[PDB]
Design a protein around this ligand. Sequence first.
Ligand SMILES: CC(=O)N[C@@H](Cc1ccccc1Cl)C(=O)N1CCC[C@]12C=C[C@@H]1CC[C@@H](C(=O)N3CCC[C@@H]4C=C[C@H]5CC[C@@H](C(=O)O)N5C(=O)[C@H]43)N1C2=O
Length: 113
Amino acid sequence: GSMSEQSICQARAAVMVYDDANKKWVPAGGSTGFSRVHIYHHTGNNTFRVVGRKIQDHQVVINCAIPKGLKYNQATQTFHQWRDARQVYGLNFGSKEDANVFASAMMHALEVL
Ligand SMILES: CC(=O)N[C@@H](Cc1ccccc1Cl)C(=O)N1CCC[C@]12C=C[C@@H]1CC[C@@H](C(=O)N3CCC[C@@H]4C=C[C@H]5CC[C@@H](C(=O)O)N5C(=O)[C@H]43)N1C2=O
């Protein structure tokens, strides 16, 4: 938390999860809109996670570990995505600057893990 984790970036993005059964992206957490998406570094054990909160109502729409070896796909300059055993996640960034901020922090996490 506040004492164990440190934010290494903030970026604006609509967070989406892939509905594998329907072959469609769905808003993470149930409602379409932009979130503030952090990567948080647990400095103690050198782990990272992605945490995003809807700007409007503060709902946490994503909270997922970044595992070592993750393949992070920059599909376009403003839409990046990744997978784990359970979900495919997509970040539709509000600008290329946000995309670069977040990708730059994710790529750091992946090299230091
Ligand atoms: C082997 C594998 O798993 N491959 C993954 C990718 C991957 C590769 C390597 C490592 C991890 C991963 Cl994750 C894969 O390809 N995946 C993950 C499931 C989703 C998808 C599969 C098919 C569709 C084709 C279309 C494409 C897609 O979704 N978009 C294209 C460009 C961005 C464009 C942007 C936004 C969203 C807003 C909704 C819709 C729209 O804009 O209307 N849309 C889009 O159309 C978006 N797909 C994918 O990304």
